[PDB]
Amino acid sequence: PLPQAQTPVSLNEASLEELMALPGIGPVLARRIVEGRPYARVEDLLKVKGIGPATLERLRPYLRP
Ligand SMILES: [Cl-]
Known part of the structure; x- marks a missing residue:
């Protein structure tokens, strides 16, 4: 569940877990x-x-740089 308070998610600054909250993004893609x-x-x-x-x-x- 990607909470509203964390969007848009920054591709450059998000942690692995935060990226993993994105639809279709697992641990391999997040890495x-x-x-x-x-x-x-x-x-x-x-x-x-x-x-x-x-x-x-x-x-x-859901994304921003
Ligand atoms: Cl952009």
Whole structure:
């Protein structure tokens, strides 16, 4: 349950657990997201292995750099 008080979630500053609260993001993807930092824009998430456009499409409303 991703609480409202934690959104939008920062791709650059969130902890692993916070990223794992995002729909479709498990421990493996959360780890790759941290390892891929920094992100200049949310669309840079496409550099992370496993995050396809359909995945990203669902996450856009909840993310910020
Ligand atoms: Cl952005």
